[PDB]
Design a protein around this ligand. Structure first.
Ligand SMILES: CC(=O)N[C@@H]1[C@@H](O)[C@H](O)[C@@H](CO)O[C@H]1O
Ligand SMILES: CC(=O)N[C@@H]1[C@@H](O)[C@H](O)[C@@H](CO)O[C@H]1O
Ligand SMILES: *[C@@H]1O[C@H](CO)[C@@H](O)[C@H](O)[C@H]1NC(C)=O
Ligand SMILES: *[C@@H]1O[C@H](CO)[C@@H](O)[C@H](O)[C@H]1NC(C)=O
Ligand SMILES: *[C@@H]1O[C@H](CO)[C@@H](O)[C@H](O)[C@H]1NC(C)=O
Ligand SMILES: *[C@@H]1O[C@H](CO)[C@@H](O)[C@H](O)[C@H]1NC(C)=O
Ligand SMILES: *[C@@H]1O[C@H](CO)[C@@H](O)[C@H](O)[C@H]1NC(C)=O
Ligand SMILES: *[C@@H]1O[C@H](CO)[C@@H](O)[C@H](O)[C@H]1NC(C)=O
Ligand SMILES: [Ca+2]
Ligand SMILES: [Ca+2]
Ligand SMILES: [Cl-]
Ligand SMILES: [Zn+2]
Ligand SMILES: [Zn+2]
Ligand SMILES: [Zn+2]
Ligand SMILES: [Zn+2]
Lengths: 123, 695, 695, 123
């Protein structure tokens, strides 16, 4: 099986920086691509930033592109997501979304293996 | 002793083993693995029975990416945050993950730079497309990044047109509308191109110059090399190819003007807008290229093997082919390489039992062909003074299997008859043709558009190792292979062309499970070389040349007649060309009659006649060459300048007539047309007179 | 059947009769008399026994004076009264007053105009004279008429230097210090130049182009001719030659600066000043040219005769020579034309007796040679594709007598040995050597400066019909003729060169009373052609080429070593050239060893070796050619650009090194020197590998 | 024998024009050169203008370049010498001189076959 263990949560006031790192354990397929989904407490589910095994990435939240960055290492089978100058509206639950195809999409339906999730609170 | 024994000695299992041997590690030109493969080829050819095998070496300018700094195209916001990054590499094929030295996709000889700007879709980057943008669509590509799609032209012409338009950088990509056969799964479970697959290839415009730094002379050790700023045909803007999985992300935000026509639109789910920059939401966002690839002089090695002729050792019949690859070359070129290896083995096992060819056979495993035909061109430059007096014919052996449908032959008209005869003797591997000759299957599957009952034989163009031998030296050439259904698939090349997925499993499963098509291509090339280097009288026929000359003259005459008022005003006439063609026809008829009636026992007279046949092809070579292309000297079949790879015969007149209605001075252009008509007519008459009575 | 019979068949009386025949009416190229002479030559060669005779014809641009408006140079006062007028024509030689169509002296291809200015003496109008003129004498030629003296250079270079200096016009004259042998009476009572005698000749700078309007292709009927403004090597200023009787009147009033050195001073009773304009008494007086000569495309005819070869009919041994003249051509060229006619007659009588040469012999009476070697060049252009594959050797036959002292041979090193052997078999016509071989007299009278006991053989330059065959096609050539004492006389050519006084009586009385020297030259050329076209193995030796190659390499190396600090700074090296010469020596030694031991009975192997010897010479031909001179392609022996007609071998490197200390950018010049060294070394190595083992 | 017949004598006042035409008879040689020598009553002998059989001419008296001109024709075997704007000082005797060599010289010693002479009185 594949488990997307999520970690790095916290509650830091506005202007802080959080690190959301997650590994990819048990992934048998040679090719992978996964995305960091953010769901607000009162809104729907939207993508934020995705990365692929081909060392290609994108941030879908163009409005807050400077605040959010994505990186990965295949040696650790791990991916990190970095906050800059957090703001109160960033308080949301963050999920992992991994899939076979080495593409980057904003659709949550294309992803079958989903992460545990992580609460992020900004005051 | 007999050609039948040679053809029966070739085996498909040996082809399979050689392909497996050559398609397991990367063999990029200028690397250590290519040198090791050259050494293995030398040793195996020596063991097979070749008289002498040598490793000719040259120092040519190649291009490599910076392994420390990979290339990637990015999209930057107002603050340059690089919101979207392209793929750094394509996923390795299964079973090849642990393999190292897999170079990332890159356009060879691209300069460096960090250009920024907006994006303009230019369809296939053809001249007609740019004409549509500037004359009709009111688009100025200058200062903007140009993105095109692979197909219908050479990459070099794409980059050259983008340069003339004034663009900052070029992004090439493979659309599913041109490299994704319908109903076919991608490479891991089929033979179609996945999203990560990227086509490689050089973007040079050398015009048959070989080494960019040594135009006209071989790149030996005591060589003087010009500055790269003064080098021949070097691109001046960065170029980097991607897969459609990333071009979709590049073009989804694209906005501005609508596409000119559905022809411009491809298969990706994007608006395919042409307008510079993105839409209103992302107008501020721009595209920044990151190219740091470098050029360096490195050593390449051609393998040359000799089988001395028993009766006429000075006459060389050459079986060429190149060994360099991009990643693994499961088809390009290791299919042809394995075919050449097995042909050499059969020749050697016939030689070990006392047999010797009547004429010398030179086998050649070239190198650095994917970098501008460098190895073969430099070797021909070094040995030009020998090949011009001793080169009977050249047989090119590049990738053998392009599809499992039918044969495809591109050769000079002097070989057509021979091409037919051998094909009648061989067997057809195709279905519905068990116990049938290859001739009838080839004819039915590929009928000649003009004649009936004769198979279609296309022209000899450029872009491979035959180019230096044919377009400059003037040595009769010929290529044969298997290809796709011409009239149905309607996509260029094959989906995994010049890709990391061009592995051995692809050939073994989806292109030739039993290697019967490789076996048939090997039989065709081997029997062709055998009859070429073994027949008493050279199997050349000049009547075919006369017929095709008349056809080409009629075609160019019609293209000119498209402007009757201009030709009437400037008195442009084609009577000289037609008279030359008619005299060629008559002299060829008389020479053929003399060939039918002459004493073959006398060796001197037979040498005379075979020399006439040999130098018929060389007579078409123009010492001065085509304008601005001194290294293209074939008057009849030289590549065109503007509409190359789709151009017509008599390239001088055709180029002169091209877009003649847009010239500022019509009188000068029509005078140039008359000059090219004069040159063509004189060349045809001279080549005819070489077949006249010898004093 | 034997060469002895052919040599004994030549008769001096026949030479006398033919010379009398060809030297009674003017035979200027493009006229009716030249056409009648061509017809007579064709008929007589047909009667002699030639297998075929034809009149090839071309339409080339010639130059003629206006018979209504003669050209002349005048001296005009302030009101332009034309106080002094030059001579309109030379006084006709006795016995030729009633003869018509005697064209007045003129410089062919001179443009029109009425330029006015001041005179500037420029000595021989060489580059060195213009340097001493400009960088020493602080005197500007621009806007001034320049008058120069014939000698030491070709007229074309004189006019080119005058054009570069910016002069309005050129006046060429012949000084008694260079064309009046001491103690010799003028033509009516001797063989010296009178005061009215004028030398003619073209002033073109075609650099082997041939027809000015058709560079690279023959001038047939269906030819496209460029505009005269776009013609190749056309002078842009009027040029008119005069005798010293008129230059005495032109230079007597000359004032200004004194001559720089006694070398500039001639033999005329004239102060030989250089200062622009006349003495302050006549400072207002100016010099006005009157040139109205026109250019027109007229038809010229070359007579081509063919004697088919018995064993190897495709191998052409050519005996060239031109028929056009200026006024009567008593020596140039009818002296050699009669020899050619008698050689043809002897060959024909041997053919009628039953004999046939082993190789085909092509005789040629060229035309329009005095107009830029037009006829021979155009014919070679038309038949280049044949001569490049079938031309064994070429034997030029121009004016055969230049003086009654000793023989003189200019040939490729491949013929040296043959020459010697033939010269050993003949007899010496000279006094003090009766009953002795011509070899010993030639050696004693003309010892080689570098050897002992071997006669001096000079290089093959340019300026005659051998030029197109040797310097572009690369066919082995040779010239032999009688000349003056190389040391004692010290004057250029002969006094009546290209003059109206070059009549038959001059040759009959003052140059060859008994035609024994003409007979000896005919024997030399005929035996040379006989041994060339009749020997089983081609009489060519490559060791001589190796030796002369080493000598030339040493000479050019010393010329380069003249700048040791520059070569050290830019790392200019000659090791490649010396290694190439050494490899050529070794390979030539081994090839000669194979030649000494091989079965001559086998026709195919003998053809192999003969083809190798044949193509050794063509191996030196550079397809791209020398810079700015695409029609000079001989790497070793091509004419130089700056110091032509006195230049050194390896013209590329020599031209690159010439005045290299005056270049603005030394790095570029020394890089060009390195490039030429690389080209020369590669060419030598390739020509060596041509003689290597055939597979 | 060779005779130089002279004519054209006339005592025309100042500003007049005279044609001095002289014919050469019995000349056996192929080439010739002839000259016009003017001698003043109170001065020495000097050359005025010469012409040659090569159709080459020269005017020795540079001050009289426009006044005096020379033109010969071999069809009639004669030469013409034209006056312009005659002046009183031009009153003199004019001789014809002929010589073998076809050069032009002002020396009276080179010429041997000398003309009859002609008086010209410009008043
Ligand atoms: C097709 C067209 O006119 N393109 C123009 C180009 O001519 C001009 O040099 C450039 C300068 O901004 O702008 C763009
Ligand atoms: C060597 C030299 O100084 N030549 C110049 C010349 O170029 C110029 O035309 C002339 C004045 O017109 O003065 C002088
Ligand atoms: C793109 O690459 C640059 C340089 O490697 C890096 O700084 C940036 O974070 C990357 N962005 C994405 C979205 O991968
Ligand atoms: C690759 O890029 C790095 C970045 O600084 C540079 O140091 C290195 O020299 C480059 N490699 C080359 C140019 O071969
Ligand atoms: C092989 O032939 C089959 C049957 O025609 C065809 O469906 C398949 O596409 C071919 N494979 C190729 C051309 O790679
Ligand atoms: C010669 O000059 C005369 C003078 O007018 C001219 O009429 C004639 O055409 C000229 N001859 C030519 C140019 O052949
Ligand atoms: C012929 O020879 C004699 C004696 O050597 C010599 O005086 C004379 O000048 C020669 N004539 C020539 C070279 O025309
Ligand atoms: C020179 O020639 C011109 C033109 O023919 C003529 O007018 C003039 O009189 C001549 N002068 C002399 C000195 O012969
Ligand atoms: Ca090269
Ligand atoms: Ca020509
Ligand atoms: Cl191929
Ligand atoms: Zn290939
Ligand atoms: Zn390829
Ligand atoms: Zn001559
Ligand atoms: Zn001449």
């Amino acid at each position: 099986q594949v488990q997307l263990q999520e970690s790095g949560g916290g509650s830091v006031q506005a202007g802080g920086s959080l690190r959301l790192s997650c590994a990819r354990s048990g992934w048998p397929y040679s090719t992978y691509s996964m995305n960091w989904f953010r769901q607000a407490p009162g809104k729907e589910r939207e993508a934020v930033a995705g990365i692929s095994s081909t060392m290609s990435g994108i941030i879908f939240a163009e409005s807050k592109a400077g605040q959010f960055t994505i990186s990965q290492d295949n040696a650790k089978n791990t991916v990190y997501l970095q906050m800059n100058n957090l703001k109160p509206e960033d308080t949301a639950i963050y999920y992992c979304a991994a899939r076979r195809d080495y593409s980057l999409s904003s659709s949550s339906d294309d992803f079958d293996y989903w992460g545990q999730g992580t609460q992020v609170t900004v005051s | 002793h007999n050609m039948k024994a040679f053809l029966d000695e070739l085996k498909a299992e040996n082809i399979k083993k050689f392909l497996y041997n050559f398609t397991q590690i990367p063999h990029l030109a200028g690397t250590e693995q290519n040198f090791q493969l050259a050494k293995q080829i030398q040793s195996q050819w020596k063991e097979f029975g070749l008289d002498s095998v040598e490793l000719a070496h040259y120092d040519v300018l190649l291009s490599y990416p910076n392994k420390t700094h990979p290339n990637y195209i990015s999209i930057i916001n107002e603050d340059g945050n690089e919101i979207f990054n392209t793929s750094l590499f394509e996923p390795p094929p299964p079973g090849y993950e642990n393999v190292s030295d897999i170079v990332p996709p890159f356009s060879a000889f691209s300069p460096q730079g960090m250009p920024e700007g907006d994006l303009v879709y230019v369809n296939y980057a053809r001249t007609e497309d740019f004409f549509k943008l500037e004359r009709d669509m009111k688009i100025n590509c200058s200062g903007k990044i140009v993105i095109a799609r692979y197909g219908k032209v050479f990459r070099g012409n794409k980059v050259k047109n983008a340069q003339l338009a004034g663009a900052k950088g070029v992004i090439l990509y493979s659309d599913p509308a041109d490299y994704f056969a319908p109903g076919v799964k991608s490479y891991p479970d089929g033979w179609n191109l996945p999203g990560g697959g990227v086509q490689r290839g050089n973007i040079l415009n050398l015009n048959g110059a070989g080494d960019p730094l040594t135009p006209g002379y071989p790149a030996n050790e005591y060589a003087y090399r010009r500055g790269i700023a003064e080098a021949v045909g070097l691109p001046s803007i960065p170029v980097h190819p991607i897969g459609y999985y990333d071009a979709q992300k590049l073009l989804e935000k694209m906005g501005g003007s609508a596409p000119p026509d559905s022809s411009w639109r491809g298969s990706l789910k994007v608006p395919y807008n042409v307008g510079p920059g993105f839409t209103g939401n992302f107008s501020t966002q721009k595209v920044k290229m990151h190219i740091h690839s470098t050029n360096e002089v490195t050593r390449i090695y051609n393998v040359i093997g000799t089988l001395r002729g028993a009766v006429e050792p000075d006459r060389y019949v050459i079986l060429g082919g190149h060994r360099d690859s991009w990643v693994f070359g499961g088809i390009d070129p290791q299919s042809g390489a394995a075919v050449v290896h097995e042909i050499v083995r059969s020749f050697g096992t016939l030689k070990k039992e006392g047999w010797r060819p009547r004429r010398t056979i030179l086998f050649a495993s070239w190198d650095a062909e994917e970098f501008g035909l460098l190895g073969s061109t430099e070797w021909a430059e070094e040995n030009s003074r020998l090949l011009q007096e001793r080169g009977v014919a050249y047989i090119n052996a590049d990738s053998s299997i392009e599809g499992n449908y039918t044969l495809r032959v591109d050769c000079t008209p002097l070989m057509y008859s021979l091409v037919h005869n051998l094909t009648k003797e061989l067997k057809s591997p195709d279905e519905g043709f068990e116990g049938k000759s290859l001739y009838e299957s080839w004819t039915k599957k590929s009928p000649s558009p003009e004649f009936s009952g004769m198979p279609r034989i296309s022209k000899l163009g450029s872009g491979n190792d035959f180019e230096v031998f044919f377009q400059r030296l003037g040595i009769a050439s010929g290529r044969a292979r298997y290809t796709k259904n011409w009239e149905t698939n309607k996509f260029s090349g094959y989906p995994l062309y010049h890709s990391v997925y061009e592995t051995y499993e692809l050939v073994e499963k989806f292109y030739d499970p039993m290697f019967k098509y490789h076996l048939t291509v090997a039989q065709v090339r081997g029997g062709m070389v055998f009859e070429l280097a073994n027949s008493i009288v050279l199997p050349f026929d000049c009547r075919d040349y006369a017929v095709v000359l008349r056809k080409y003259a009629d075609k160019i005459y019609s293209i000119s007649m498209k402007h009757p008022q201009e030709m009437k005003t400037y008195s442009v006439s084609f009577d000289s060309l037609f008279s030359a063609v008619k005299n060629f026809t008559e002299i060829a008829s008389k020479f053929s009659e003399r060939l039918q009636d002459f004493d073959k026992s006398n060796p001197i007279v037979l040498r005379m006649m075979n020399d006439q046949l040999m130098f018929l092809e060389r007579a078409f070579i123009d010492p001065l060459g085509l304008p601005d292309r001194p290294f293209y000297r074939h008057v009849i079949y030289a590549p065109s300048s503007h509409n190359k790879y789709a151009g017509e015969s008599f390239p001088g007149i055709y180029d002169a007539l091209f877009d003649i209605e847009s010239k500022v001075d019509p009188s000068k252009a029509w005078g140039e047309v008359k000059r090219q008509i004069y040159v063509a007519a004189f060349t045809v008459q001279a080549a005819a007179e070489t077949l006249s009575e010898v004093a």
